[PDB]
Structure formats: structure tokens, C-alpha cells
């Protein structure tokens, strides 16, 4: 689990999970939008799914 947020930084610095996911999105299709409209939708949807 920690591997999800321990993004590839110096030291053992972590990144926000929001960023981690953004990277995993760019993998699929490079994102052309500066603002992450998608993240609040997906976080909410995710939270419901887990519950």
C-alpha cells in the first residue's frame, strides 16, 4: 500500500495520492487538462464503491 504514495522522489519523500493517480492516468492517455475535474468525481465514486 505505501508503494501507492511513495512516488519516485529523492529521499523517501512521498507524493499525494492524487498525483500518484494522475500519473497512472497519463499512462493510459496523456492528459491535456491542467485542472483535475476528474479527481473529485472519481474520489467520490471510489468512496461509494468501497463502502
Amino acid at each position: 500500500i505505501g508503494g501507492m504514495v511513495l512516488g519516485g522522489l529523492t529521499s523517501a519523500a512521498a507524493i499525494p495520492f492524487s498525483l500518484a493517480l494522475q500519473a497512472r492516468l497519463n499512462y493510459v492517455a496523456l492528459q491535456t487538462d491542467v485542472l483535475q475535474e476528474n479527481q473529485k468525481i472519481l474520489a467520490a465514486s471510489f468512496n461509494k464503491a468501497i463502502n
Binding site: L30, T32, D33, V34, L35
Partner: protein
């Protein structure tokens, strides 16, 4: 590179002219046409 508008803060801050010092062989053709 690809062009995307927006400029989401955490970017190299640079003028079009200065850009050639970041990306070699960049040519500001419009400026060039105005000068030549």
C-alpha cells in the same frame, strides 16, 4: 513537446524569446519576419 494552454503554475516561467535557450533550434518566426 505538445501545446496545452493553461499553464498550471509549476512551469518554467519564460518569454517566447527566451524559449530558444531552453529548446535549441526554436525559431520565433513571427518576430523573425518583423525583423527581416
Amino acid at each position: 513537446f505538445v501545446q496545452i494552454y493553461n499553464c498550471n503554475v509549476t512551469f518554467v516561467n519564460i518569454s517566447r524569446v527566451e524559449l530558444h535557450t531552453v529548446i535549441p533550434d526554436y525559431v520565433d518566426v513571427n518576430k523573425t519576419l518583423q525583423e527581416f
